[PDB]
Amino acid sequence: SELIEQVIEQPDSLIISPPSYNHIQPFVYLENHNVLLILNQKITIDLISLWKKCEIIVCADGGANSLYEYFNLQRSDYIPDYIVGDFDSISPDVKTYYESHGSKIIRQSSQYYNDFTKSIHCIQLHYQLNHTKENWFESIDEVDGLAKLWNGLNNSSDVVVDIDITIYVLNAIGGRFDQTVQSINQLYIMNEDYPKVTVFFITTNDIIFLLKKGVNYISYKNRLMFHKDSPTPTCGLLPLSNKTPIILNSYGLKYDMRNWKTEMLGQVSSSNRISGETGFIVECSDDIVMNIEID
Amino acid sequence: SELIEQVIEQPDSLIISPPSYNHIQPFVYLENHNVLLILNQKITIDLISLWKKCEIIVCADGGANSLYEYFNLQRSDYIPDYIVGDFDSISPDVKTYYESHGSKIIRQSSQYYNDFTKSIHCIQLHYQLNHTKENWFESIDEVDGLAKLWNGLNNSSDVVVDIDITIYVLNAIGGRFDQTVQSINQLYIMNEDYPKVTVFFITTNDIIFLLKKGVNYISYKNRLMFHKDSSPTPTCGLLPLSNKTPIILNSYGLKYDMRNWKTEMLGQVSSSNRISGETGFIVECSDDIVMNIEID
Ligand SMILES: Cc1ncc(C[n+]2csc(CCO)c2C)c(N)n1
Ligand SMILES: Cc1ncc(C[n+]2csc(CCO)c2C)c(N)n1
Ligand SMILES: [Mg+2]
Ligand SMILES: [Mg+2]
Ligand SMILES: [Mg+2]
Ligand SMILES: [Mg+2]
């Protein structure tokens, strides 16, 4: 708390050279094992382009409707590998359609896990058991079998801890606020327990991800890739965990921070902008969420 | 930390008697110095009904476009009292329109406060100086005059700490994520600094407000006022988004009632909960905590 906090107003363009540090490339999809997780909300992004870059696609219940309604390109060319959840939102017509086309249906009635977490368990269990059994999900407990199987396969130590996964999550932010918060909560929890799983929330307004404790280097070919020709893209660093405060040091943002303490009920960097033409750096005393405006 | 955490599954309908405690009535606007603050996003709700119940209406920059574009039955009958911000989003056409109709224009170029906080300062200063001077905002510092004039006077001098205000904020949630978080951050900050100011974020999906440390009693005529007759009961969540953690919760009237239940980010968080109380419910918390309730 001794070091003086600083906020440096930088020029609109700067060249930041690469800094062990955490390297983040949020916009590769706009050019590891890629996964597309589709939650329940209208799909506005270029679904097709994202789909083509993913190994598996999972729909979280109502998310299947969102996928279905997007084509009304041939709908039959994009069948989700898995459809997971309590199914209190997916419509029979949509359910029938995809089931007849081969989607692996996994019903989980548990009222203690949401469609997002259930879908996440499905994804993790997939990369652990699918190469062994195509129907690994069959006959499992219909209440919370995924949850039990996941955090239970670790007791037998049959879990491959080494596998880099990138999960692109659609429709998880922006809707009901408690769902947005649970999604962020899971983002933090998942990094704590599964640091090799990288999650990107792609929304209508921005891309949201997690900066890891320590140095983070975020790169991209150029800002034009995600910001059509404001002259510069906006961003924010959001201290939403139970670890507070967070000490930030950035290099490449319009309002660069040095030994700047951030915390909810304190100062929070919002409406910041990106000056780095090819990348920027953010060092943090603990994991922290970052959002970057897209288009 | 010793008491056992409990989650009690309750029937879909329960009768909760009132509890000394914080009484919250989030839906009276569907059923007091009311203020309507409009940020920049398309207006989906029944604007006119809310406007009618508000004493003052403020547009945060682009929020003026949102108000203007809403009438695309007479736009001229709804002129905002103030239009505040750096004005990078408001369009000249809209700006000229309301200007000519008497809206009080308060430009603040400061790049260290957003349109929301600037609008909040304007609202607080209004209830302090407006009754004494109609054009109190004139000639103030155009960079951060509102910010300096407020807290710079919020010190035992002219301020009148006794003033109950209810601010209804539109378009503050659901847009760019950093704006959503800054809004929630301010929600927390405002309560500790200005406890008599009650804020309600009205979004396309729910109403969001703050539960105060201690006992909270949320009441309404019936769940029908905010939940049209797939799901029989309205959804809700208790979100621990402050730097005070963990929060111990004790609820009476939710579908999944909590007892001695510790909530925190990176821990367990109550989401997709539901309201069983027919006329209200109780939530006791060890510290302020955010609550959202589905509106449909
Ligand atoms: C670390 C840091 N983050 C953001 C801002 C300023 N930012 C916050 S509000 C606003 C104006 C919005 O109309 C801007 C540009 C800063 N100064 N320092
Ligand atoms: C305190 C508390 N809050 C929420 C839930 C359960 N809730 C969380 S996920 C889910 C199912 C969503 O499809 C439900 C109902 C609980 N059990 N206890
Ligand atoms: Mg569901
Ligand atoms: Mg579920
Ligand atoms: Mg503005
Ligand atoms: Mg501003």
Residue numbers in the entry:
A (entry chain A): 5 to 23, 30 to 41, 49 to 89, 100 to 256, 260 to 325
B (entry chain B): 5 to 23, 30 to 41, 49 to 89, 100 to 256, 259 to 325
Authors' own words:
The production of thiamine pyrophosphate (TPP), catalyzed by TPK, is critical for both catabolic and anabolic cellular processes. In yeast, this thiamine phosphate is then hydrolyzed into thiamine before pyrophosphorylation by the TPK that catalyzes the transfer of a pyrophosphate (PPi) from ATP to thiamine, resulting in AMP and TPP. CA1462 is a homodimer, with each monomer constituted of two domains.
The strong electronic density is consistent with thiamine molecules present at the thiamine binding site. The thiamine ammonium group N4 of the amidopyrimidine ring is engaged in a salt bridge with the Q138A main-chain carbonyl oxygen. The opposite side of this ring is stabilized by another salt bridge involving N1 and the oxygen from the S299B side chain. As observed in the mouse TPK/TPP complex, an Mg2+ ion is maintained by electrostatic interactions with the side chain of the four strictly conserved aspartate residues (D78, D113A, D115, D142). Interestingly, the C. albicans TPK/thiamine complex reveals a second Mg2+ partially stabilized by the hydroxyl group O1 of thiamine and a salt bridge with D113 and D142 side chains and with two main chain carboxy oxygens (Y140, N141). The nitrogen atom from the K145 side chain participates in the last coordination (Mg2+ number 2). As proposed by Timm et al., this lysine could be involved in the activation of the thiamine hydroxyl by the stabilization of a water molecule or, as in this C. albicans structure, of a magnesium ion. In the C. albicans thiamine complex, 2 water molecules take the place of oxygen atoms from the proximal thiamine phosphate. The equivalent glutamine (Q206A) adopts the same conformation in the C. albicans TPK/thiamine complex and an opened conformation in the C. albicans TPK/TPNP complex. The structure containing thiamine only exhibits the closed conformation, while both are present in the TPK/TPNP complex.
